[PDB]
Ligand SMILES: Nc1ncnc2c1ncn2[C@@H]1O[C@H](COP(=O)(O)O)[C@@H](O)[C@H]1O
């Protein structure tokens with residue numbers, strides 16, 4: 381089996397690039413992401429739209445309530461070995477994402493050391509202002525009102541109803557920013573979808589900055605995968 385590993389920081393187009401290989405090959409893409417295993421935050425965690433998937437399969441390591449906590453790395457790693465191992469007949473698989481903790485587990489693990497052919501791609505953080513431009517665009521996409529999927533702000537207001545979800549959303553990118561933006565201006569979280577467009581731009585900007593901060597960590601704590 382051939383494993384096509386695509387990894388790198390947030391907003392580096394890794395997802396689209398995975399999808400493209402998946403349409404050409406017919407191979408599933410397995411998301412190397414813990415946060416995306418909570419579908420109640422599908423949009424804000426970076427899950428592609430069903431329309432964007434272009435009929436390819438994208439596999440998550442678990443499907444879980446946000447209030448059960450984000451899947452831990454060692455559990456997600458064990459889950460990942462499983463999704464690969466039972467598909468071992470298949471010609472290939474695409475592993476794509478940016479979970480720092482799960483990539484590091486992959487790098488300590490004997491499983492990946494033998495038994496596979498490999499195509500490895502690391503996307504790198506480029507210049508910051510190019511990064512920010514792409515970050516903002518992405519945030520605006522997640523913010524867009526659609527009749528087929530909740531916005532990030534909608535996902536956030538829905539959960540904010542459940543007190544146990546509150547501590548957990550405050551440790552997640554986009555959400556932490558959005559929560560802090562609301563307190564900063566004395567708005568209720570429920571009220572975040574209804575802000576004037578002037579306040580909307582301020583928030584796109586702040587979330588982008590929180591993405592840059594995260595992409596910078598990804599660059600430090602990412603394992604250097606051998607090519
Ligand atoms: N898809 C994602 N969306 C938002 N935040 C994320 C995502 N993946 C990781 N994070 C953040 O990065 C921190 C470390 O997770 P990880 O990169 O999976 O080890 C998490 O606690 C989240 O705050």
Ligand SMILES: [Cl-]
Pocket residue numbers: 389390391392393394395396
């Ligand atoms: Cl990406």
